[PDB]
A paper describes a structure:
The system studied was a reversibly switchable fluorescent protein (rsFP) which is a representative of a class of proteins that undergo a reversible photolysis reaction from a highly fluorescent “on” state to a weakly fluorescence “off” state. The specific rsFP used, rsKiiro, is a mutant of Skylan-NS33 specifically developed for ultrafast time-resolved crystallographic studies due to its ability to form crystals that diffract to high resolution (∼1.1 Å for single-crystal cryo-MX), high photoswitching quantum yield (∼18% Trans-to-Cis in the crystal), and high protein expression yields. Structurally, rsKiiro is similar to green fluorescent protein (GFP) with an 11-stranded β-barrel surrounding an α helix. The chromophore of rsKiiro is formed from the Ala-Tyr-Gly tripeptide at residue numbers 62–64 in the α helix.
In this study, we probed the light-induced reverse reaction, from the Trans to Cis chromophore conformation, initiated with 2 ms 405 nm pulses at a range of optical flash energy densities (0.1–6.7 mJ/mm2) after the initial Cis-to-Trans photoconversion had been driven to completion using ∼13 mW/mm2 of 473 nm CW illumination. A total of 435,200 images were obtained across 6 laser energy densities at 405 nm of 0, 0.1, 0.53, 1.78, 6.74, and 14.43 mJ/mm2. From these images, 79,976 single-crystal indexed diffraction patterns were obtained and merged into 6 data sets for each corresponding laser energy density. Data below a value of 0.5 in Fourier shell correlation were discarded, leading to a uniform limit of 1.7 Å being applied to all data sets. The initial examination of the chromophore-omitted maps clearly shows increasing occupancy of the Cis state at higher energy densities. A clear difference in reaction yield can be seen even when comparing the lowest flash energies (0.00 and 0.10 mJ/mm2), where a difference of 3% population transfer is determined from the shift in the minima.
Numbering used by the authors: 2 to 61, 65 to 221
The structure:
Amino acid sequence: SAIKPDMKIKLRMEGNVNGHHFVIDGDGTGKPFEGKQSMDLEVKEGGPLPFAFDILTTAFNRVFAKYPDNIQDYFKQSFPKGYSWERSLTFEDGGICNARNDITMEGDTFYNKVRFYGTNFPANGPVMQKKTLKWEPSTEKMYVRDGVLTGDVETALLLEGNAHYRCDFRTTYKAKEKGVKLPGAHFVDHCIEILSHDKDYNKVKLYEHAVAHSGLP
């Protein structure tokens, strides 16, 4: 196994939401086999961010997910050469964006080159007004569509005042190494939370727990 039980995470995201440019650095640690990761995020440029930090978090690696023996782990088989993903998020009020991550490994460290582009968010909407509280736990459906590993998520952000703001993600995953065998369809349950933050989310501690299953208990 190229992958150790304890892997470090290095991350730089360059992005633009509704015109606003920003650069965010990440430094964290994770247990790939337990499906757990936590990282410290620091806004390096464009702060304070004039939009809800929460729309970024899922962009801050499915290599951190507990896979049972009876599902093919595409992600952990992708290393050490690594893999990329591209994602389109579609929000109920027209807000759309495209995120990509190119993931590489060097010794005990995953390096992440992340790009995040958002547009069409209404000025009076929960994202530009900063009314989001968190992502609800989600289930990512994994399947193959025209020879590409694809994940669909129908989810929501909890808003101030008991309301939800609906998310549809579609992610395409591609190993750098030709002939990493595609897995069979399956599910990944996700648990993403902001553990701590300063006043304007210039510094954020992020945690994710993910588990792969066939649908049964």
